[PDB]
RNA sequence: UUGACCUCAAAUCAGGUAGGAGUACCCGCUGAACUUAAGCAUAUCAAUAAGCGGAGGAAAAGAAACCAACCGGGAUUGC
RNA sequence: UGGUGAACUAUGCCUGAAUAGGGUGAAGCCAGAGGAAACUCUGGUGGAGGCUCGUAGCGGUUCUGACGUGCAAAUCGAUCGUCGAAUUUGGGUAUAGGGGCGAAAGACUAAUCGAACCAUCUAGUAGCUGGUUCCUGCCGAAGUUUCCCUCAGGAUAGCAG
RNA sequence: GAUGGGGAAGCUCCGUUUCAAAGGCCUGAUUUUAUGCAGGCCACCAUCGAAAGGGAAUCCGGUUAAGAUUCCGGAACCUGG
RNA sequence: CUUGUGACGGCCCGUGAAAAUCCACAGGAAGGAAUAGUUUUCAUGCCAGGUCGUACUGAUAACCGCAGCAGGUCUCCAAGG
RNA sequence: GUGAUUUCUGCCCAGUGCUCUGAAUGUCAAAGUGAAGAAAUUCAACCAAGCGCGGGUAAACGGCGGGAGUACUCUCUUAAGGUAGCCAAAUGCCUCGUCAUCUAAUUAGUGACGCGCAUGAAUGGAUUAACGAGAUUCCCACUGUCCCUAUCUAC
RNA sequence: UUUACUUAUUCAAUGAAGCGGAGCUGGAAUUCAUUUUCCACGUUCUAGCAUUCAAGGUCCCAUUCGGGGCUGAUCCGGGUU
RNA sequence: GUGGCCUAUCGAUCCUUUAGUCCCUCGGAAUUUGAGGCUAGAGGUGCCAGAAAAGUUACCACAGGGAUAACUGGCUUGUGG
């Protein structure tokens, strides 16, 4: 009974939500996220996972400060009014 | 081939010793000043059972000579020690059972136990139940003592090493048959995960050197060289002789 | 090379202990046999004479 | 006793700086096998892919412990 | 090559929990009797055992029953093994892929195991199988020679344009 | 599972009291006063880990379409000050 | 009958957690009364008790098995013959 | 490794392993030493462990023969020749072995026999109470398994 | 090949507490002139107790509430053993 | 008369080595060792136009094959009847 009766015993999560990415990939016993690598300082990325890099790279979010850097450069980082 | 069972034992994943119900390391009192210039008197408060150990332990209380407090040491109980007995530890201690005299100050034929190898490691030799060390001879110049060990070997150790006079309590245990796989289960359940033992000749050849074949047989000789490597040392390692002698 | 070994592990052996070990190993029997063979060689020459 | 020197510390001491992201191109380390040899082990793939460390608008290299053998040339880079 | 899994399951640890009613009647003890003494006998008491019949529970022997495009990628029915322990089990925790764990079947490691899964190298290689897209006109074969780890393949000569 | 350390080219690995100068505790004293200087005491030595282990203290009656040992009425208890 | 508990008895080469936390004792540091104090482990009296969860199912239809699947999934209460 | 108890575990160290505190130039690396050379280099001596020589070890892996004569004995051969036990056994080709028993009839069962293709002693041998969803044979009871089929209910 | 030496290196313990040398004070000791040495150098019927820079002695201070130094508890070398 | 009366009686590249020329080269210039070349032999591939090479799989896998076995059918009928 490795199929249907064994699927009834599944009610204990191995992963919960992660703090940096909100992914539900944070392993409870390992205390590590399997997608972004929290709590390591570097973010988990691999050159074989180029599509995953495309999924989580810069520009897939809000860019709350980086949207204005090109415009401030074009104006020359001016000050005043 | 796979990694065999005795090869897997050294990682210590499930092969660590079960130490939940143990009462502390049974060591001798440290050799500070009193034990090497005079003696010191302590008291046996209680004799208790140690989990996974065949011998009982003794809880001996001394006074700290430098601070107002009490020290509690765990000795291995000698056969004949009772609760409320005064235990004397030191160079000038009188020769009675339970006392912790150094080996330079006991005569020929003395039976001691919990013997230090070097002066100060707080007990190494003859600690299992019913075992003892006999003093075979002295050597004052180049101050050493010869001792007979429980294995029958004769060691030559320092005369400043200490030992508890008498034999370890709880002797004669292995004379009783266990009679039951349940009894062996409860015996090893508090020691470590090394039981039950599957024979390697009953395995598959991926799992052991002895495994495989259309009959259960070893194949080559079971005596293994000392220069063999891990994964090969399964059998009788470096056997000088085999068989039942008559 | 042999001397190094004897010093390393067999230094603390009383002669009585050593003799027992040698008998168990079977080294003693070999020494005796070698000597016996030497005696045999001399005996053969005498027989020819 | 007092005052130096040397060395080593402590401060939510005064002021600073490093980490992470990106990584097409750049500077290094580490490092395969599929494949080809009509098999295969040196070889090849390849001083490559994957992995790790570190920069900039370029980086690196760069003003000879050079090339030459000629009636000698003259930093580096690229075609 | 680099990562992800012990939510199933294997094993150890830590902390909890669960297990009707019967049968047999072990030590210890009490009374009576006998004996010269050792000690024996009889009647009770007591309630031992990896004992036994048998529920809940755990498992899965047979019908090679049902079903077999099923209720179900392993179930249903009857018959069964076991049922106070080497028992069953929750949660926490540890062991990760030539590695783990195994009362040992090459078993189990998320329906995947005589080496898991994911992505990349990778459009891996194939003397082997299958396919290969409009018309008309003209010419029109070979299965033979020699060499090859050659015998389902090539080179070379021949035949053809 | 950090730190002190020690490996590792490195991502990181070991170790958890270790070859560390590892800290805070009460009385106060002073009443330019702030909290130093009077003192004296103590050496564990991060932290995480149980909604079934340990653990301060609440019960009854009534009430809603849907909440209650939590609201209402009454009657208690514990902790800190 | 279910359950709680007490005093016992049997078993073991099995003798069947730890820490936070609270109390007591030994000790005698120090502070202390006579026109006055010393005591808040006695009684009464005063103030405050933050944050998050709290509905419902828990299974032949609320979970997992592609589903409103005869499967699987821990536990408490338990009337009469 | 073997697998409760009882009773035993015979012979063989030649081979393959394992192991010696033996004896010591046979094999004999790098470094080092010596000679020749102008030097690169060449040639020798010396030379650690391990091999090689000498022992031990079978509850280590394993092994346990022939030909004659009259159970016995002789001869050859080997490391030593199967001991105690057991058997057409789950191990026997021939084989449906031979004898007895069980039946009307038995390639099945059981008890014996043993030149046993190719049984055999911790590769464990023989025996064995109790136990077994283990394999096999016979007997009593019992029955639609069958002679030989018929009928009824629910879906 | 044997054999010193310790500071490199290595192992172990401790909250780095009693190391080494010399000296007292006793005992043995035979001294052949005066001491050569060697052992000691506060604890053993009893499941109590042992802590407040220590009492005492002594010397200062400015007496008072007390405070400090030496000794009690032998010197010397800072090599934790 | 350019081996055996005739028809069989044998071997590439790379590497090593020998003989000859004592000839050519070691590329800044020479001498001498050393090395590399040219011409002709030898060391050998017997699977003989010339890979350096043990098994097992009843746990097995892939690409194919009726070019190829284990059934029936078909031809034949030795053998059988
Ligand atoms: Mg186990
Ligand atoms: Mg085998
Ligand atoms: Zn994350």
Question: Which chain B residues are closer than 8 Å to C24 by Cβ?
Answer: 240-241
Give the Cα separation of B109 and A28 in Å (integer): 63
Shortest Cα–Cα distance, B146 to chain C (Å) = 10
Which nucleotides of strand I come closer than 7 angstroms to any CB of the protein? Answer: 2, 12-15, 17-19, 41-48, 50-51
**Distances in whole angstroms, Cα of residue B50 to Cα of each of A2, B20, B26, B114, C28:** 43, 11, 10, 16, 47
Please check whether residue B226 touches C, CB under 8 A.
no
Resolution of the deposited coordinates, in angstroms? 2.6
In degrees, rounded to 5, the angle at the alpha carbon of residue B204 between the alpha carbons of residues B198 and B206 is 110
In C, residues 23-42, which contact B (CB 8 Å cutoff)?
A: 24-25
User: Among residues B114, B96, B118, which one has the least CA distance to residue B39?
Assistant: B96
Please report the number of interchain residue pairs, chain B to chain C, with beta-carbon separation below 8 angstroms.
8
- How far from chain centre, in Å, is Cα A51? 13
Instruction: For chains A and B, tell me whether 3 or more CB atom pairs sit within 8 A of each other.
Output: no
Give the Cα separation of A40 and A36 in Å (integer): 9
User: Among residues B100, B113, B120, which one has the least CA distance to residue B30?
Assistant: B120
Q: Longest C-alpha distance within chain B, in Å? A: 74
Give the Cα separation of B147 and B112 in Å (integer): 10
User: Among residues B40, B78, B46, which one has the least CA distance to residue B59?
Assistant: B46
Spell out the residues 6+ positions from residue B132 whose beta carbon is closer than 8 angstroms to its own. B111, B112, B113, B126, B150, B166, B167, B168
Give the Cα separation of B176 and B174 in Å (integer): 5
What interhelical angle do C15-25 and C27-48 show, nearest 10? 70
Contact status, residue B188 vs residue B195, Cβ threshold 8 Å: yes
Spell out the residues 6+ positions from residue B205 whose beta carbon is closer than 8 angstroms to its own. B1, B211, B212
For residue B138, the cross-strand partners are B145
In the numeric block, the tokens 């009679």 are attached to B179
Give the Cα separation of A13 and A8 in Å (integer): 14
* β strands within chain B, DSSP E: 39-49, 56-63, 70-76, 86-90, 111-113, 133-139, 144-148, 154-158, 164-165, 223-224, 236-237
**With an 8 Å Cβ cutoff, are C24 and B154 in contact?**
no
User: Among residues B216, B57, B34, B32, which one has the least CA distance to residue B128?
Assistant: B57
Phi, psi of B58 (to 5 degrees): -125, 135
Q: How many CB atoms lie within 10 A of CB B81?
A: 20
Which other chains touch chain A, taking contact as 3+ CB pairs less than 8 Å apart?
A: none
Shortest Cα–Cα distance, C33 to chain B (Å) = 20
Number of H helices, E strands in chain B: 3, 11
Helices (H), chain B: 5-8, 34-37, 181-188
**With an 8 Å Cβ cutoff, are C12 and B156 in contact?**
yes
Give the 3-state secondary structure percentages of chain B, helix then strand then coil, rounded to 5.
Answer: 10, 25, 65
Phi, psi of B182 (to 5 degrees): -65, -40
Of the listed ligands, the closest to the CA of B200 is: 2
Helices (H), B86-232: 181-188
Rg value, chain C, Cα: 16
DSSP state of A72: H
For residue B149, cis peptide bond before it (omega within 30 degrees of 0): no
Contact status, residue B90 vs residue B98, Cβ threshold 8 Å: no
B154 → closest Cβ in C12, C24, C25: C12
**Distances in whole angstroms, Cα of residue B82 to Cα of each of B23, B43, B87:** 19, 10, 10
User: Among residues B218, B217, B235, which one has the least CA distance to residue B226?
Assistant: B235
**With an 8 Å Cβ cutoff, are B240 and C17 in contact?**
no
**With an 8 Å Cβ cutoff, are B240 and C24 in contact?**
yes
Contact status, residue B211 vs residue B205, Cβ threshold 8 Å: yes
């Amino acid at each position: 009974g490795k199929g249907t009766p064994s699927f009834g015993k599944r009610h204990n999560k191995s992963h919960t939500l992660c703090n940096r990415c909100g992914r539900r990939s944070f392993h409870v016993q390992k205390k590590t996220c399997s997608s972004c690598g929290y709590p390591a300082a570097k973010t988990r990325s691999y050159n074989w996972g180029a599509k995953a890099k495309r999924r989580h790279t810069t520009g897939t979010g809000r860019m709350r400060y980086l949207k204005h850097v090109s415009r401030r450069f074009k104006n020359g980082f001016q000050t005043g009014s | 081939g796979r990694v065999i069972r005795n090869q897997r034992k050294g990682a210590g994943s499930i092969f660590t010793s079960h130490t939940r119900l143990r009462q502390g390391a049974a060591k001798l009192r440290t050799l500070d000043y009193a034990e090497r210039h005079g003696y010191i008197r302590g008291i046996v408060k209680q004799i208790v059972h140690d989990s996974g150990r065949g011998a009982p332990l003794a809880k001996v209380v001394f006074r700290d000579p430098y601070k107002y407090r009490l020290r509690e040491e765990i000795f291995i109980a000698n056969e004949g020690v009772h609760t409320g007995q005064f235990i004397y530890a030191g160079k000038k201690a009188s020769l009675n059972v339970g006392n912790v005299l150094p080996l330079g100050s006991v005569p020929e034929g003395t039976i001691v136990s919990n013997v230090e190898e070097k002066p100060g490691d707080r007990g190494a030799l003859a600690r299992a139940s019913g075992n003892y060390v006999i003093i075979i001879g002295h050597n004052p110049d180049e101050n050493k003592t010869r001792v007979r060990l429980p294995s029958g070997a004769k060691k030559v150790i320092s005369s400043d090493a200490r030992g508890v006079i008498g034999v370890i309590a709880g002797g004669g245990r292995v004379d009783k048959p266990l009679l039951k796989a349940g009894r062996a289960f409860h015996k090893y359940r508090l020691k470590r995960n090394s039981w039950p033992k599957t024979r390697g000749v009953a395995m598959n050849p991926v799992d052991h050197p002895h495994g495989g074949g259309n009959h259960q047989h070893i194949g080559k000789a079971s005596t293994i060289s000392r220069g063999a490597v891990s994964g090969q040392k399964a059998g009788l390692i470096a056997a000088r002789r085999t068989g039942l002698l008559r | 090379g042999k001397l190094k070994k004897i010093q390393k592990k067999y230094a603390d052996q009383d002669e009585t202990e050593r003799l027992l070990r040698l008998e168990a190993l079977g080294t003693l029997k070999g020494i005796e046999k070698q000597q016996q063979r030497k005696k045999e060689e001399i005996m053969k020459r005498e027989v020819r004479e």
